[PDB]
Scaffold this active site. Structure first.
Site, PDB file in Angstrom:
ATOM      1  N   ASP A 162       0.801  -1.210   0.000  1.00  0.00           N
ATOM      2  CA  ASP A 162       0.000   0.000   0.000  1.00  0.00           C
ATOM      3  C   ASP A 162       0.844   1.275   0.000  1.00  0.00           C
ATOM      4  O   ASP A 162       1.425   1.621   1.046  1.00  0.00           O
ATOM      5  CB  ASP A 162      -0.955   0.004   1.203  1.00  0.00           C
ATOM      6  CG  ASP A 162      -1.689   1.329   1.361  1.00  0.00           C
ATOM      7  OD1 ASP A 162      -1.777   2.062   0.364  1.00  0.00           O
ATOM      8  OD2 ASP A 162      -2.185   1.645   2.468  1.00  0.00           O
ATOM      9  N   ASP A 184      -1.343   5.564  -5.547  1.00  0.00           N
ATOM     10  CA  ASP A 184      -1.700   4.701  -4.411  1.00  0.00           C
ATOM     11  C   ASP A 184      -2.043   3.272  -4.819  1.00  0.00           C
ATOM     12  O   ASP A 184      -3.169   2.967  -5.320  1.00  0.00           O
ATOM     13  CB  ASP A 184      -2.870   5.299  -3.644  1.00  0.00           C
ATOM     14  CG  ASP A 184      -3.267   4.476  -2.437  1.00  0.00           C
ATOM     15  OD1 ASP A 184      -2.666   3.405  -2.197  1.00  0.00           O
ATOM     16  OD2 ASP A 184      -4.203   4.909  -1.712  1.00  0.00           O
TER      17      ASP A 184
HETATM   18  C1  757 Z   1      -4.020   6.832   7.297  1.00  0.00           C
HETATM   19  C2  757 Z   1      -3.828   7.342   5.865  1.00  0.00           C
HETATM   20  C3  757 Z   1      -2.418   7.107   5.376  1.00  0.00           C
HETATM   21  C4  757 Z   1      -4.933   6.772   4.964  1.00  0.00           C
HETATM   22  N1  757 Z   1      -4.577   6.240   3.639  1.00  0.00           N
HETATM   23  C5  757 Z   1      -5.513   5.646   2.859  1.00  0.00           C
HETATM   24  O1  757 Z   1      -6.645   5.542   3.309  1.00  0.00           O
HETATM   25  C6  757 Z   1      -5.245   5.101   1.447  1.00  0.00           C
HETATM   26  C7  757 Z   1      -4.807   3.621   1.418  1.00  0.00           C
HETATM   27  O2  757 Z   1      -4.314   3.180   0.149  1.00  0.00           O
HETATM   28  C8  757 Z   1      -5.930   2.670   1.777  1.00  0.00           C
HETATM   29  C9  757 Z   1      -5.257   1.342   2.152  1.00  0.00           C
HETATM   30  O3  757 Z   1      -5.932   0.145   1.731  1.00  0.00           O
HETATM   31  C10 757 Z   1      -7.051  -0.415   2.324  1.00  0.00           C
HETATM   32  C11 757 Z   1      -7.593  -1.632   1.888  1.00  0.00           C
HETATM   33  C12 757 Z   1      -8.743  -2.166   2.498  1.00  0.00           C
HETATM   34  F1  757 Z   1      -9.289  -3.333   2.087  1.00  0.00           F
HETATM   35  C13 757 Z   1      -9.356  -1.506   3.552  1.00  0.00           C
HETATM   36  C14 757 Z   1      -8.817  -0.304   3.979  1.00  0.00           C
HETATM   37  F2  757 Z   1      -9.370   0.363   4.994  1.00  0.00           F
HETATM   38  C15 757 Z   1      -7.681   0.228   3.380  1.00  0.00           C
HETATM   39  N2  757 Z   1      -6.908   2.383   0.747  1.00  0.00           N
HETATM   40  C16 757 Z   1      -8.175   2.802   0.690  1.00  0.00           C
HETATM   41  O4  757 Z   1      -8.663   3.530   1.541  1.00  0.00           O
HETATM   42  C17 757 Z   1      -9.056   2.291  -0.438  1.00  0.00           C
HETATM   43  C18 757 Z   1      -8.936   0.937  -0.754  1.00  0.00           C
HETATM   44  C19 757 Z   1      -9.715   0.367  -1.742  1.00  0.00           C
HETATM   45  C20 757 Z   1      -9.582  -1.102  -2.067  1.00  0.00           C
HETATM   46  O5  757 Z   1     -10.531  -1.703  -2.586  1.00  0.00           O
HETATM   47  N3  757 Z   1      -8.471  -1.769  -1.765  1.00  0.00           N
HETATM   48  C21 757 Z   1      -8.245  -3.145  -2.144  1.00  0.00           C
HETATM   49  C22 757 Z   1      -7.457  -3.842  -1.044  1.00  0.00           C
HETATM   50  C23 757 Z   1      -7.546  -3.165  -3.472  1.00  0.00           C
HETATM   51  C24 757 Z   1      -8.179  -3.755  -4.586  1.00  0.00           C
HETATM   52  C25 757 Z   1      -7.553  -3.781  -5.839  1.00  0.00           C
HETATM   53  C26 757 Z   1      -6.275  -3.221  -6.000  1.00  0.00           C
HETATM   54  C27 757 Z   1      -5.635  -2.633  -4.898  1.00  0.00           C
HETATM   55  C28 757 Z   1      -6.278  -2.596  -3.653  1.00  0.00           C
HETATM   56  C29 757 Z   1     -10.649   1.175  -2.415  1.00  0.00           C
HETATM   57  C30 757 Z   1     -10.786   2.531  -2.129  1.00  0.00           C
HETATM   58  N4  757 Z   1     -11.735   3.328  -2.809  1.00  0.00           N
HETATM   59  C31 757 Z   1     -12.343   4.426  -2.073  1.00  0.00           C
HETATM   60  S1  757 Z   1     -12.232   3.113  -4.260  1.00  0.00           S
HETATM   61  C32 757 Z   1     -13.670   2.263  -4.206  1.00  0.00           C
HETATM   62  O6  757 Z   1     -11.280   2.366  -5.083  1.00  0.00           O
HETATM   63  O7  757 Z   1     -12.527   4.412  -4.833  1.00  0.00           O
HETATM   64  C33 757 Z   1      -9.990   3.072  -1.118  1.00  0.00           C
HETATM   65  C34 757 Z   1      -5.841   7.968   4.879  1.00  0.00           C
HETATM   66  O8  757 Z   1      -5.650   8.828   4.035  1.00  0.00           O
HETATM   67  N5  757 Z   1      -6.809   8.092   5.795  1.00  0.00           N
HETATM   68  C35 757 Z   1      -7.650   9.128   5.778  1.00  0.00           C
HETATM   69  C36 757 Z   1      -8.848   9.000   5.103  1.00  0.00           C
HETATM   70  C37 757 Z   1      -9.757  10.048   5.044  1.00  0.00           C
HETATM   71  C38 757 Z   1     -11.034   9.801   4.279  1.00  0.00           C
HETATM   72  O9  757 Z   1     -10.965   9.402   3.091  1.00  0.00           O
HETATM   73  O10 757 Z   1     -12.150   9.953   4.834  1.00  0.00           O
HETATM   74  C39 757 Z   1      -9.435  11.253   5.687  1.00  0.00           C
HETATM   75  C40 757 Z   1      -8.211  11.353   6.363  1.00  0.00           C
HETATM   76  C41 757 Z   1      -7.772  12.589   7.068  1.00  0.00           C
HETATM   77  O11 757 Z   1      -7.654  12.561   8.317  1.00  0.00           O
HETATM   78  O12 757 Z   1      -7.499  13.608   6.386  1.00  0.00           O
HETATM   79  C42 757 Z   1      -7.321  10.300   6.410  1.00  0.00           C
END
Ligand code: 757
Length: 369
Positions: A35, A219
Site C-alpha cells: 500500500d 496509491d
Molecule cells: C491513514 C492514511 C495514510 C490513509 N490512507 C488511505 O486511506 C489510502 C490507502 O491506500 C488505503 C489502504 O488500503 C485499504 C484496503 C482495504 F481493504 C481496507 C482499507 F481500509 C484500506 N486504501 C483505501 O482507503 C481504499 C482501498 C480500496 C480497495 O478496494 N483496496 C483493495 C485492497 C484493493 C483492490 C484492488 C487493488 C488494490 C487494492 C478502495 C478505495 N476506494 C475508495 S475506491 C472504491 O477504489 O474508490 C480506497 C488515509 O488517508 N486516511 C484518511 C482518510 C480520510 C477519508 O478518506 O475519509 C481522511 C483522512 C484525514 O484525516 O485527512 C485520512
C-alpha cells in the site's frame, strides 16, 4: 537479487496485491498488502472471520511491546491495535532482515476482505502520514537505515492477478520504452501533479488546479481512479456520451451495479481512452500516461462478461489507483524525489489501441495550496 523478486506479488482480481513476508523468530509467514497510500506496517494479531492465519507475538523471542496503542482510518475500513517492534524479512525480496515497527491489529472494521488471502498491510509512504505521528518510522525507512538496500522501489502490477515489487533498484528487463519521471511534490503521500486531462483527445478544459484539488496521489492500495467532484462529473459525462449507443443502469456510473455482454463481444472500441498529463522533470515539460477501457472497467465475477466501472468520485483529491497503475511499470524514486512510469510487459493488449507512457510535451501553477 532481482530475478528472485520478479513475480513476487499475487492477488485476486479487485482485492489487492500482496507480497509474502515474515515477522518474528521463528519466522511467521504472512501475506501483506502493498500500500503506497499509507505508512503503517500492520498485521492481524487476533482471530477474525476472514483471517485464515495471524501474528502471535508471544511466539516470538524477538517481540518488544512498545506499550502504545494505534488507530488507523482509511477511506475504506479502519483498525486499531498494539504497537511493537520485531524482525522482518521478505522471502522473495532482498536478502536482509530488519527490526521494524509493527502494529498488531486487535480489532478492525471493514478492513480485511473475505477471500482476499492477505493478512496485513505494508504502507510504503512517508513518515509524515504515519499514525500516531511521524515519530513512528515506516518499514521502508527502517530498511534503508538498517541496511544497504538503495532508497528506491518499483511496482509492476498486472491485471486480467500477479506482479512484481523490485525493492532497492530498477529491473530493466520488466518494462519497454523509456522511464518518464514526475516530481514527488512533497513527501507525505506520493503526491504528484496532473497538468492536463484528455478523453479521446478532447481536453476537459478545466483550470489545471482542479485536477489536483486538494492533492493528487499515486496509491497502489486503492482500486479505482478517483477524481475530484468537478473532474469526475466532466469525465463521466464524456464516457457516457461516447458510449450512449448502449444502455447502462444510471447507478452503474456510481459503481453500484454491473454491465454485461456475451462472451468475447464487449464493445471496448466505444469506450474512450483517458490521458493523464503528469508534470515533467523540467520547466514546462509534461508527459502522459494513456489509459484504456480495459483498465477502468474492472472484470467482475453463468458465462457472461461483466464489468464494474472503476472510476469514482472523491473529495480528498485524485487517487491514481490500481486502475491506472496496472498497465505500467511504476518507480518510486525516493532518493530522487520522483516517480517514474514506463509501459509494462504485462500491459493491456488490444489489436487497435495501446496504453502508453509518452512524451515530451509543453505547457505554460497546477498545484493546490
Ligand atoms: C491513514 C492514511 C495514510 C490513509 N490512507 C488511505 O486511506 C489510502 C490507502 O491506500 C488505503 C489502504 O488500503 C485499504 C484496503 C482495504 F481493504 C481496507 C482499507 F481500509 C484500506 N486504501 C483505501 O482507503 C481504499 C482501498 C480500496 C480497495 O478496494 N483496496 C483493495 C485492497 C484493493 C483492490 C484492488 C487493488 C488494490 C487494492 C478502495 C478505495 N476506494 C475508495 S475506491 C472504491 O477504489 O474508490 C480506497 C488515509 O488517508 N486516511 C484518511 C482518510 C480520510 C477519508 O478518506 O475519509 C481522511 C483522512 C484525514 O484525516 O485527512 C485520512
Amino acid at each position: 537479487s532481482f530475478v528472485e523478486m520478479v513475480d513476487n506479488l499475487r492477488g485476486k482480481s479487485g482485492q489487492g496485491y500482496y507480497v509474502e513476508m515474515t515477522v518474528g523468530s521463528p519466522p511467521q509467514t504472512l501475506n501483506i498488502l502493498v500500500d503506497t497510500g499509507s505508512s503503517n506496517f500492520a498485521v492481524g494479531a487476533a482471530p477474525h472471520p476472514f483471517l485464515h492465519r495471524y501474528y502471535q507475538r508471544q511466539l516470538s523471542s524477538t517481540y518488544r511491546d512498545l506499550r502504545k496503542g494505534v488507530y488507523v482510518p482509511y477511506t475504506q475500513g479502519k483498525w486499531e491495535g498494539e504497537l511493537g517492534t520485531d524482525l522482518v524479512s521478505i522471502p522473495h525480496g532482498p536478502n536482509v532482515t530488519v527490526r521494524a515497527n509493527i502494529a498488531a491489529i486487535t480489532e478492525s472494521d471493514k478492513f480485511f476482505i473475505n477471500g482476499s488471502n492477505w493478512e496485513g498491510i505494508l504502507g510504503l509512504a512517508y513518515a509524515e502520514i504515519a499514525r500516531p505521528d511521524d515519530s513512528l518510522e515506516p518499514f521502508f525507512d527502517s530498511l534503508v537505515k538498517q541496511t544497504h538496500v538503495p532508497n528506491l522501489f518499483s511496482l509492476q502490477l498486472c491485471g486480467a492477478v500477479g506482479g512484481s515489487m523490485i525493492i532497492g533498484g530498477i529491473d530493466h528487463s520488466l518494462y519497454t520504452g523509456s522511464l518518464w519521471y514526475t516530481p514527488i511534490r512533497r513527501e507525505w503521500y506520493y503526491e504528484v501533479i496532473i497538468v492536463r486531462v484528455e478523453i479521446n483527445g478532447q481536453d476537459l478544459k478545466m483550470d489545471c488546479k482542479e485536477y489536483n484539488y486538494d492533492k493528487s496521489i499515486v496509491d497502489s492500495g486503492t482500486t479505482n481512479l478517483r477524481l475530484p467532484k468537478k473532474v469526475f462529473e466532466a469525465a463521466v459525462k464524456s464516457i457516457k456520451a461516447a458510449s450512449s449507443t448502449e444502455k447502462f443502469p444510471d447507478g452503474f456510473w456510481l459503481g453500484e451495479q454491473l454491465v454485461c455482454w456475451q462472451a468475447g463481444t464487449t464493445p471496448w472500441n466505444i469506450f474512450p481512452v483517458i490521458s493523464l498529463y503528469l508534470m515533467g522533470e523540467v520547466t514546462n515539460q509534461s508527459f502522459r500516461i494513456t489509459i484504456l477501457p480495459q483498465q477502468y472497467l474492472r472484470p467482475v465475477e453463468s458465462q457472461d462478461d461483466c464489468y464494474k466501472f472503476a472510476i469514482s468520485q472523491s473529495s480528498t483529491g485524485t487517487v491514481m489507483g490500481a486502475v491506472i497503475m496496472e498497465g505500467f511499470y511504476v518507480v518510486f524514486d525516493r532518493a530522487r524525489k520522483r516517480i517514474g512510469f514506463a509501459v509494462s510487459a504485462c500491459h493491456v493488449h488490444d489489436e487497435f489501441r495501446t496504453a502508453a507512457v509518452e512524451g515530451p510535451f509543453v505547457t505554460l501553477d497546477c498545484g493546490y495550496n
